[PDB]
Structure formats: C-alpha cells, structure tokens
Design a protein around this ligand. Structure first.
Ligand SMILES: NC(=O)c1ccc[n+]([C@@H]2O[C@H](COP(=O)([O-])OP(=O)(O)OC[C@H]3O[C@@H](n4cnc5c(N)ncnc54)[C@H](OP(=O)(O)O)[C@@H]3O)[C@@H](O)[C@H]2O)c1
Ligand SMILES: NC(=O)c1ccc[n+]([C@@H]2O[C@H](COP(=O)([O-])OP(=O)(O)OC[C@H]3O[C@@H](n4cnc5c(N)ncnc54)[C@H](OP(=O)(O)O)[C@@H]3O)[C@@H](O)[C@H]2O)c1
Ligand SMILES: [Cl-]
Ligand SMILES: [Cl-]
Ligand SMILES: [Cl-]
Ligand SMILES: [K+]
Ligand SMILES: [K+]
Ligand SMILES: [K+]
Ligand SMILES: [K+]
Ligand SMILES: [K+]
Ligand SMILES: [K+]
Ligand SMILES: [K+]
Ligand SMILES: [K+]
Ligand SMILES: [K+]
Ligand SMILES: [K+]
Ligand SMILES: [K+]
Ligand SMILES: [K+]
Ligand SMILES: [Mg+2]
Ligand SMILES: [Mg+2]
Ligand SMILES: [Mg+2]
Ligand SMILES: [Mg+2]
Ligand SMILES: [Mg+2]
Ligand SMILES: [Mg+2]
Lengths: 308, 308
C-alpha cells in the first residue's frame, strides 16, 4: 500500500489550526495538502481528520486525530479497504493535569473563590469545606492513556487510588483494580469518580441513577471520556437531590452544551468545553504519530493504533 | 518548665473552631480549656493563640497556631520569661496543593472556563492559551515547609524547578538553588514565581517593579507568603502594563483586600482570601505540635519550633 499524499481535512480545526499541523508535517516524504469538506479522494491518499466523511472511503488510510473514534463507522472502513488509525497515547499529560486541576479546585475551593472574586467578596469558607487530596480516595474508571495520566498524578499527590478496567488486571499506582461487573464496589467509597473509557456499546449509559445511588453523597463525578457514558438526565437528577455533591464535566451528551442545560447552574459543577486535552502543541503531538505510521505503511509493518 | 493547663484563646477561631481543637487534646495529659479574649493567666499556663495578647506574658508558654509570627512582639517574650513556639511544619500539603491548583488552573485555563460558566457560554480558548505544567519552569522563593510542598508537587508534575533560600544549600527536587542576592537570575526564565518566605526585614518589598521587569512577560506570580513581600501597587502597575501575565494571590498588603483594589478585576489574577493553608483538619495538625512540645516540657528537652 503506497501513500503518495497526506490530505489534512478542514475538521482538524476543531483541535488545532490546519496550517500549524500542515507545517509540522513538512519533510514527510509525500506532499501534505489541505482538504476542504467536499473534496474527493483516491488510491494513494492518506487523510488526517477529526470527523468521518464517506468520501474518505476512496482513500487508503484515515488517521483520526482523536483518541475516541466512536463517530467513525468502523465496519464500513474494513469493507472499503481503508485503514483507520486513532490518536490514543498522546493525551495523558493534558487530561491528567486537567483532572488533577479539577480535584484540587474542589479540595482547595478555588472555584468558590473565583465566584467571590467577581463580587469583590472576601468570603471565608466554612471550616468543613477545604480539604486535601492527600489521603482521599479516587476511583478511575478506564485505565488507559487518560486513566493512567490521572492515576499517576493522583498517586503522587498522596491519594488512595482504585480503578476499573475491562480485564481487571493490575495497574501501577492503582492499589485495587476491579472488572466492570464490580463497578459499584469500586466507586462506593471514593471521594472522586473519574470516567476515562471509550464510548462503546458496552460503556454507553454506564453511569446512571443506580451508580449515583451507590456513590458517596459527598463525592464528585469527573467525566473526561464522552458525554453518553453518563445518562445526563440522571446526573442532573442526582445533583438536584444531593445524591452526589458535584461534578467536573468536560464532555456532554449534546455538545456544545446547550445554554439551557441545568448543568451550568450548580455551584459545585465545573463545566469545561471539551478542552481537557487542549494544548498549544497538539500539532506536534499528532504529527509524531503521522510520521510513525507513514514509516510503518511504507515498510509493510503493523500500523500503530490501528482500529480496522 | 512545668505545665498544668492549656488555655485555647478564642482567636484560634480565625483558623479552626476552638472546641474542635480543645476536644482533639482531651488525652494530652493536662486539662485544655476555652479562654475568652480578656482572661488572665499565670504560672503553669500554656496558651494556644492566633495573635498576641499582653495578658499571655503572665503564662509560661504561648504556642502561636500560625507559621508566621511576624505579628508577635518576639523581643518582649524573652523579658517576661514566656516561651514562644510557632506552627511551621504543618502547612506543606495544604499550601503545596493550593499552589499546584493555581498553576494547573492557569495552564489548563480553568478560571476562564469558570467565568464562561456563569454566562452559560461555551467559549473555546485561543490555540496558544492551554499548556502543560510538564516541561515548564517554576522558581520557588523560600525553600522551607511551604516551599518544599510546592517543589515536590511541581517536580512530580514534570516541572523544571529552581529556587531561592537564605543558605544557598541544595534542596531535594530543586535543580538549582540560588541565594537571595541572585533573585533576578533565579526568576528571569520562570513561567511561575512562587513566594514562600516569612515576612522579615530582608524580605519586605522583595518583589517590586524591577523584579516584574526581570520576569518573563508570560509569567505568573504566586504569593502565599505575606502580602508585604510584594509592593502591591507595583504589581498592579505590572499587570496593567503587561510586564507579567498574571498572579495567584492569597495574601495582600491590606486584608481583607479592599473592594476598590484593581486586583479583583484582572482575568488572569486569582484572588483567594488567605486560605491557601485552610483545612477541615487544622485542629489535628496543630494538636500534633502541642503533644510534641508537652512531651519536651515533661522530659526537659528543647522545644520544637521555638522562636524565643
Ligand atoms: N475529553 C477529551 O478531550 C478526551 C481526550 C482523549 C480521549 N478522550 C476519551 O477517552 C477515551 C479513552 O482514551 P484512552 O486514550 O485512555 O484509551 P485507551 O488507552 O484505549 O484506554 C481505554 C481504557 O478503558 C478501559 N475500558 C474499556 N471498557 C471499559 C469498561 N466497560 N469499564 C471500564 N474500563 C473499560 C480499557 O480496559 P483494559 O485496560 O482492560 O483494556 C482501558 O483501560 C477515548 O476513547 C475518548 O472517548 C477524551
Ligand atoms: N498563606 C498562608 O496561609 C500561609 C501559611 C503558612 C505560612 N505562610 C507564610 O509562609 C512563611 C514561610 O513558612 P514556612 O513554614 O515555609 O517557613 P520555613 O519552613 O521557616 O521556611 C522559610 C524559608 O524561607 C527562606 N528564606 C528566608 N529569607 C529568605 C529570603 N530573603 N529569600 C529567600 N528565601 C528566604 C528560608 O531559607 P533557609 O532555608 O536557607 O533558611 C527557608 O527556606 C511563614 O512565615 C508565613 O509568613 C502563609
Ligand atoms: Cl444521556
Ligand atoms: Cl466544631
Ligand atoms: Cl505593599
Ligand atoms: K479504499
Ligand atoms: K492508549
Ligand atoms: K498496583
Ligand atoms: K449517593
Ligand atoms: K451511597
Ligand atoms: K479526643
Ligand atoms: K511569664
Ligand atoms: K519548617
Ligand atoms: K537538588
Ligand atoms: K527591595
Ligand atoms: K517583564
Ligand atoms: K524580562
Ligand atoms: Mg458557600
Ligand atoms: Mg449500572
Ligand atoms: Mg447559571
Ligand atoms: Mg519497522
Ligand atoms: Mg529588588
Ligand atoms: Mg470586578
């Protein structure tokens, strides 16, 4: 399979300016070209894209610039003979730092202080409100690149770390790992529950009213995975009733989050606009994977992060 | 010395409910009692207090429940034969976590997102705005309990750490230690400059217009020390002119921060109301110091954290 061109789909703009990425891929050994949204593809084309387009099935290879490839019809790629790769492996530091930032925000009450800053108010916390992450329990659901980025930072901060993954097998810096049919055992005693799984048939709606019942009333949910891993209306109901204390949410069942969502209005909810993995160097981070896979395809080696 | 009672001055309420601290010391080996602000003291009395009262000079021992004793008349304690101890040693985790929180808030843009949350606005950052702490440089000025709490967390997050202390001697997790006469060299290339010194003769007004000139235009100041280590009007001017990018400020020249201060209104300033060390377990953390010095008094050993 003989790549002659890398097309950079305009949808990459949802993560990074296309020209920054195109410039990062100079010296690839094939030309790199911008592709607008209604262009055609053919043999010899590789495409780098955020979203899926059916026109891509005329190309030889699509590199999805996201870790999560849930919006791509994987079955149709195989039939068309188009390779599909993803960008898992590059988001550990960005998302790990954002999640550490969410947990420290809640522990040290930074968000409440920011609210007060708008009012020029010197509002002192109640004695019980500020706490330390050190000594507190976090459950990380999904123990891959994202989850491990969270775990390693949580462990370094002195948290007790448990988690969940498909295999249930051990992970460094996780004291106890559970399979997904022991999720309720994993989350029950945690001060924070972090979601870092792909969106699949299995994970869709994982976290719903039963899970919020099981969680501690003083616990917070962190979702940096995909919105539909949570049943969003159940999350709203749990927040309304005080079944849990709050949440840090980067992803939602409808994005952008509608202006009329109830989720904006809770003091102890942090909303971030699907930017937990944002970075001014995303173009370099993704370019490294493209260079790697170009070499693999050129030499007949197995592609890195091949989905189908 | 021979202690028969610990009085808990009501001013401890500026950090912790007095009854919580009294009850935490129910097995100390001497009785512990609430003291109101106009009580008198005598031989055998120890007193725990946030601030100084002249009535305490009739006691044998005052434990200041703060690390910083700059509002105590140290001179006069020696004359009265009253021992004075402070609470340095107990704020590393709380302040370390807060400062990691500030830094992660700036890197990951969480404060901007909080502001947008109030407006129900899905506001995407500029491409260049989000970055990672990993790989960025922090200079920690003061390498004691606070400063080491910052250092260790910064280092674990992948930062390059340099710092400043009086002795110049190496410190674990600091790549390069400078003496205070090389402050300008220490700060010049740092993305974050963190202040963690006591307020002394030498430290007052350390950070003023010339230091803001020296610092990078993209850098942020963190002050968790004392407000007067900074020349506050010079900080405002520096922020206005874009000499530095922003600041996380827990302490100020005048506290509470006056409502007319320009500091409240900068997007890239975080105001917190002298709470970087706040904790729902402060009672336990201070109690541990009392228990340690009661053992020292009983055995005739030197007191821990003795100021005079
Ligand atoms: N918010 C953002 O900007 C952002 C950025 C990047 C990624 N994401 C999302 O995060 C997802 C994960 O990315 P990643 O790079 O960390 O993926 P990854 O490295 O493939 O890790 C996935 C992890 O999920 C586990 N898992 C799968 N099904 C599970 C289940 N039912 N319950 C519990 N754990 C389960 C896997 O278990 P095993 O270890 O046993 O295989 C693995 O530990 C992506 O698919 C994407 O949706 C979000
Ligand atoms: N915001 C808050 O709520 C909060 C909480 C606790 C403390 N504080 C403030 O923080 C201060 C430090 O507390 P701590 O427990 O960390 O004290 P500490 O353990 O005694 O450490 C003080 C450090 O400052 C260094 N130092 C002294 N003069 C300096 C100078 N001119 N330039 C640079 N470094 C200098 C000392 O250097 P050497 O090691 O070489 O002697 C030491 O490393 C307290 O005095 C208090 O004012 C604030
Ligand atoms: Cl949903
Ligand atoms: Cl109480
Ligand atoms: Cl000043
Ligand atoms: K094809
Ligand atoms: K991975
Ligand atoms: K383990
Ligand atoms: K619950
Ligand atoms: K429960
Ligand atoms: K007790
Ligand atoms: K005395
Ligand atoms: K100390
Ligand atoms: K060192
Ligand atoms: K000066
Ligand atoms: K400057
Ligand atoms: K400069
Ligand atoms: Mg409140
Ligand atoms: Mg269920
Ligand atoms: Mg609202
Ligand atoms: Mg090879
Ligand atoms: Mg100077
Ligand atoms: Mg204002």
């Amino acid at each position: 399979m003989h790549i002659e061109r890398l097309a950079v789909d305009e949808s990459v703009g949802r993560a990074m300016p296309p020209q920054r990425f195109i410039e990062a891929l100079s010296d690839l050994g094939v030309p790199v070209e911008f592709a607008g949204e209604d262009e055609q593809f053919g043999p010899g084309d590789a495409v780098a894209s955020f979203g899926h387009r059916d026109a891509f099935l005329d190309a030889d290879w699509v590199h999805c610039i996201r870790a999560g490839y849930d919006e791509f019809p994987v079955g149709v790629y195989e039939e068309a003979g188009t390779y599909l790769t993803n960008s898992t492996g590059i988001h550990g530091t960005t998302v790990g730092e954002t999640v550490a930032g969410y947990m420290l925000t809640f522990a040290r009450r930074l968000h409440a202080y920011r609210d007060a800053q708008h009012d020029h108010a010197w509002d002192l916390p109640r004695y019980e409100e500020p706490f330390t992450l050190a000594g507190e329990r976090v459950c990380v659901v999904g123990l891959g690149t994202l989850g491990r980025g969270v775990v390693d930072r949580a462990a370094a901060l002195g948290m007790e770390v448990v988690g969940v993954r498909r295999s249930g097998d051990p992970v460094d810096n996780v004291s106890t790992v559970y399979t997904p049919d022991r999720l309720h055992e994993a989350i029950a005693d945690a001060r924070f529950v972090v979601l870092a799984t792909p969106l699949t048939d299995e994970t869709e709606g994982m976290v719903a009213a039963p899970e919020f019942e099981t969680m501690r009333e003083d616990a917070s949910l962190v979702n940096v995975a995909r919105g539909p891993v949570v049943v969003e209306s159940d999350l709203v109901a749990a927040l309304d009733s005080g079944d849990i204390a709050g949440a840090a949410l980067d992803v939602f069942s409808e994005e952008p989050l509608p202006e009329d969502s109830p989720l904006w209005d809770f003091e102890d909810v942090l909303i971030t606009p699907h930017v937990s993995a944002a970075t001014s160097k995303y173009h370099e981070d993704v370019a490294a994977l493209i260079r790697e896979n170009i070499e693999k395809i050129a030499t007949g080696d197995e592609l890195t992060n091949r989905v189908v």
